[PDB]
Structures are given as C-alpha cells and as structure tokens.
Write an enzyme that holds these catalytic residues in place. Structure first.
Site, PDB file in Angstrom:
ATOM      1  N   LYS A  70       7.095   2.139   0.986  1.00  0.00           N
ATOM      2  CA  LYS A  70       7.445   1.023   0.067  1.00  0.00           C
ATOM      3  C   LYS A  70       8.554   1.485  -0.883  1.00  0.00           C
ATOM      4  CE  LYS A  70       4.372   0.150  -3.324  1.00  0.00           C
ATOM      5  NZ  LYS A  70       5.115   1.175  -4.092  1.00  0.00           N
ATOM      6  N   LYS A 124       1.242   6.399  -8.495  1.00  0.00           N
ATOM      7  CA  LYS A 124       1.094   7.491  -7.486  1.00  0.00           C
ATOM      8  C   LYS A 124       2.363   7.624  -6.634  1.00  0.00           C
ATOM      9  CE  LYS A 124       0.075   5.223  -4.004  1.00  0.00           C
ATOM     10  NZ  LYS A 124       0.641   3.853  -3.976  1.00  0.00           N
ATOM     11  N   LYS A 149       0.866  -1.199   0.000  1.00  0.00           N
ATOM     12  CA  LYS A 149       0.000   0.000   0.000  1.00  0.00           C
ATOM     13  C   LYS A 149       0.893   1.236   0.000  1.00  0.00           C
ATOM     14  CE  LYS A 149      -2.232   1.559   3.727  1.00  0.00           C
ATOM     15  NZ  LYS A 149      -1.926   2.989   3.486  1.00  0.00           N
ATOM     16  N   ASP A 182      -2.088  -0.930  -3.247  1.00  0.00           N
ATOM     17  CA  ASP A 182      -3.227  -0.326  -2.510  1.00  0.00           C
ATOM     18  C   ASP A 182      -4.500  -1.113  -2.828  1.00  0.00           C
ATOM     19  OD1 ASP A 182      -1.148   1.884  -2.887  1.00  0.00           O
ATOM     20  OD2 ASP A 182      -2.512   2.816  -1.449  1.00  0.00           O
TER      21      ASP A 182
END
Ligand code: FES
Ligand code: FES
Ligand SMILES: [Ca+2]
Ligand SMILES: [Ca+2]
Lengths: 277, 277
Positions: free
Chosen positions: A19, A46, A14, A133
C-alpha cells in the site's frame, strides 16, 4: 479548512501488500509527470509512508516528538520534510504504547498540522495513507471526520487482503451519509495468482465500484526501493513507472465516486472459494 | 479462571513477518513432539492464526458469527474447531467495521469463550496470538487484563519490526506491576539481513531480555503452507521442524521472565543505523 483547492484522498488497505509503495509512487508520478504540488500525511503507525520520497531517511513522527521532546518541539521544520519533486511528507506516528487509541493519535497529528498551518493552500493533491488492517472506530475516524471524502482501497488477490478491503468498504458505507465519504475505486497490487484480474472485476462489481488500476508485480520496485527511492525517480521510463502514471492520472481525474455495497460473510466465502484462495 | 493449569502465553508482533506461522508451528510441535494439550485463540483481526492447524479451512470468527448469526449462534461447535494433533482453535475476529474497538472485540470473544466453558481445564498450553502492529490501548487490553502473564515478542531484522517489538515492550512495562505481565523473550523470524543475529543479541540485551530462538528462513514453510499445513505435520523430520521443536521446548520450560527496559527513540535509531537498516 485543510487544502480546500486540493484533491484530498484517503488510501486504506491491509499491510504487507505494498500500500505504501503504491501511495508513494502515485504521489511521485503526480509530481513528476504532471507537475503537481503533492503532500503525503502518513496515518499507518506500522508502515513508513514517506521513506522512499525522503530517499530512505525515515522522518520523526508527530506523536513521538510530542511524547519525547514535548508539544513545543512539534514544529513544521521538525515533522514536515520535503522530498522527491518537492513532495511534502508528514508521519502521524502511533499512540502512547499500551494506553492511547491509535486513531486518536492520527487525528491529533492532523489537528497539530492544522494549527501549524502545515497544509499549503496551493496543494494540488493531499494523500492520507491510513492503516486498513482493521476498520476499528479509531482507524475509521478519518472517514467519520471527513479528512478526505475520496477513499481508495488497496487490495490483492489474497484472502485477508480482500476481507480487509470489504471491511474498509463497510466503514465507508457507515459514514457516507454523515461525512460525505465515498469510494473512488479499488487498486489491486497484483500478487500474480491464477484468475486475479477476474477475481478483482467480480469483487469490484459486487461492491458497486471499479478497478482504478491493476498494479503489476515488477522487480524494479525492489531495485528502486533498494536505492531508497521510488520507481518514478529511479527510472521514469520503465513500464512500472508508466503503470503508476496511469494510476495517478486515473485517481486525479476521477469524479465518479459511489456508496459501496459490501459483501456478506457468505458472499465473500463463495468468492474466495470460486477463485481457489 | 482460564486454563489455571496451563502455560498461557501471549505472542505479540507486527504483521508480515510470519508471527502466525511461528505460533502455529510452535503449537504443532508442542502437540506432536511433546504430546501436549494445546489451544490457540487468535487475537489478530488481520491474520489467520489457525488455518494451517485446520488444514486450510479458515474458521468463522466469534465476532462475525455474533454480528451476522447472533449471540445464540456463538456455540463451541461453531467457533471452536479441532485440528492437527487435536489442537483446539478459536478466532476472535474484528469489531463492527468503522465503529467498534478491536481490542474490545478480542476481550468480548475471550469472555464469550469463558461463558461457553471453552478453555479445557486440562489444557497444557494456551496461546493468544495478538496483533502487535500498534500497541494501542485496545490491543494492550490482554496485557492490562492479564489474559496471559508470559509474553513473547516476534520480530525480524527490519526497521518497522524492531520498532513494533520495542513498543510491545513498552506496553508490557506499562502493565507489569498492575497485571503481573512479564516478557519471556524475543523470537526472531529471520529475514536473512547482514548482521541479523548480532542485531538481535544487542536488541535483546538493551531490553534486558533474551532471544528464545532464531527461526531461520526456510522454503519448506512455503511448501508445507502450500499444502495448507504446518511444517511439523508436513515433515516432522526436517531441520525447520526441529527449529520449531527447540522453540517450543524453550517457551514451555522458560521460568525466567523480566520487566523489559525498552529503548528510547534515539537509542533505537542508533541501533538500526549501526546495522545499516
Ligand atoms: S486504534 Fe483505537 S479503536 Fe482501534
Ligand atoms: S483497536 Fe481500539 S484503541 Fe486500538
Ligand atoms: Ca484544485
Ligand atoms: Ca500444568
């Protein structure tokens, strides 16, 4: 065949839990501490998966160049940049706003890199940093296509982070037989919550996997990132650099991957209640 | 027709910048300060859009109940909960891990609520909290279907946040003529970066829209959320509660919506360079 002699891995997780920071520092530590040829292909529309390797200069995305400059403009000089310790960097980018499937955009960017012969045959390590996500058919396409059969899940001791991890595990299980994909382990980007290590041990045990590494929370990350660079480059001697070194060594030596046993709604709810999340 | 006499709005934004916190507090402030019938339908699979209204008890998602308990289990008593100030709450949930399109899952959940007659005809305000991390065809389906024709974009003075906002604007423009969707304005969840207000003014001016409100950063949010509740419920008298009150008043009185003029790659890059992002 993409990097046949490389250890190709897919990092899924997510957003908002570091990450990309963990992936970049793991690649940097492989290149820096183990003199390995490394490449990072960003597959999270994103997130900037290569900025800290590129010293803060955000690279143009394959999809954006294709959409604004055209297919001919999609060249290796344009979309593939060299960064810290000669790590190669490429960003897939997102789909045509409001029309395209983002998972398809990722695959198009990989296909375009293939056509450009942009994956060096002498790569030692190739990372695909994929958005986790939501495990929609689109973002599971790398799993279905077997872009990499070694998958690692980044999580944290936060409810949505564990829910996402469990769902990534379901997506890996979905294609394990068809594409040979397997879970190599869970990476915990520590949030520093009561019981977080025990929570992670139980989570890993219930999914039949292992904790590849517990990445502590350390303000040196922010200091290094403020200088638009990885902890490895900022200060290879600090304790956090040695954490990423251990993670990098663990992910690169790993040869025991598993078909995960994801938890049901009820099991996940029990777990987050026990650890008071 | 879903809530024909309500002001139906769609809040789109990237994750990790407080979109859900702003949406919940805006709904709470409408219910608390203006005695309005409010409903929140969460359409972000990686975010809890109703927990603070439900005092920290995370509600089951329509999709998860349909997948684990079956279609018959999808009842209004099961998926629609009442929270602070009688705000109604529903969470769409995500798709079948690794197979379903998440935007389609959102629409299925809305369709299922329709069939259940779960949108009170006397609602004053209905919010659809949609993921804006990527404007893929799936997450643009609410725009294409005109679930709500009043769209607000949550952003922050951070590069990926503005990139996402600009892409949401492209998705709104894509369907403006077909579905009548329009941009009502930009909500800035302040990150507290040098020049952030000026950056926001220029961003809004280039897109031909307006800043509905600059939501300051305030540690009372964390204190209220620690007690699993909204700032409005935690302390309606504090300054941050009055910020959400002004936002809620602005979004509910707004009657000037526009077809946005998104910025090109080059224009966005110039803007983030000028404000040193
Ligand atoms: S990004 Fe296309 S199915 Fe989700
Ligand atoms: S979630 Fe299906 S097109 Fe993106
Ligand atoms: Ca090899
Ligand atoms: Ca009305």
């Amino acid at each position: 065949e993409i990097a046949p002699d490389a250890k190709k891995v897919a990092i899924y997780g997510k957003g908002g839990i570091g990450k990309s920071t963990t992936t970049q520092n793991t690649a940097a530590a492989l290149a820096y501490f183990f003199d390995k040829k490394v490449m990072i292909h960003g597959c999270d529309p994103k997130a900037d998966s290569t900025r800290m390797i590129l010293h803060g200069k955000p690279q143009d995305t394959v999809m954006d160049v294709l959409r604004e400059e055209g297919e001919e403009a999609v060249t290796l000089e344009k979309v593939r940049k060299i960064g810290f310790k000669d790590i190669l960097c490429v960003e897939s980018g997102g789909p045509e706003p409001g029309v395209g499937c983002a998972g398809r955009g990722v695959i198009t960017a990989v296909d375009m890199m293939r056509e450009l012969e942009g994956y060096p045959d002498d790569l030692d390590n190739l990372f695909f940093d994929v958005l986790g996500d939501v495990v929609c058919g689109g973002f599971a396409m790398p799993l279905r296509d077997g872009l990499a059969q070694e998958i690692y899940i980044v999580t944290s001791g936060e409810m949505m982070a564990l829910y996402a991890a469990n769902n990534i595990a379901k997506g890996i299980l979905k294609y394990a037989e068809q594409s040979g994909v397997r879970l190599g382990g869970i990476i915990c980007n520590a949030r520093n919550v009561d019981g977080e290590k025990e929570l992670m041990d139980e989570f890993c045990d219930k999914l039949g996997t292992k904790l590849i590494h517990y990445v502590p929370r350390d303000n040196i990350v922010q200091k290094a990132e403020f200088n638009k660079m990885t902890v490895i480059e900022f200060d290879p001697e600090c304790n956090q650099a040695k954490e990423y070194r251990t993670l990098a060594k663990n992910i690169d030596e790993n040869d025991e991957l598993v078909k995960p046993t994801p938890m049901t709604m009820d099991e996940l709810e029990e777990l987050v209640v026990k650890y008071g999340l």
